[PDB]
Amino acid sequence: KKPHRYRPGTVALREIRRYQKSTELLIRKLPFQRLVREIAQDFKTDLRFQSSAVMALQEACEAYLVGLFEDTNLCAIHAKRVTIMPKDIQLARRIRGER
């Protein structure tokens, strides 16, 4: 009786702790490789990629999105929110200088 159910947020905090303690790639390798090839074929058709090049691109994108989500969370907290919304990412990117 009464199956266990964690309250909304504590599981999220446990994932935060787990994924900040760990270092592996958080995106599956094959879909990201396909995305890289999709974007690359728009610049030069019949292109080949070193495997280490794809891993370097994946590491760079992981780091960029993690930093962007850090700034996004700071923007959300600034607006007295704990959830992140697209406007948070827009503000963070525009302050960082992309927009």
Partner: peptide, 27 residues
């Protein structure tokens, strides 16, 4: 259409590494 290969749970994992507790569906 390989941008959908960056799945929703992957983006949630990325946010979790970035210390994000709650994520909107439009994120």
């Amino acid at each position: 259409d390989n941008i959908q290969g960056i799945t929703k749970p992957a983006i949630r994992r990325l946010a979790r590494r970035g210390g994000v507790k709650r994520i909107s569906g439009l994120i």
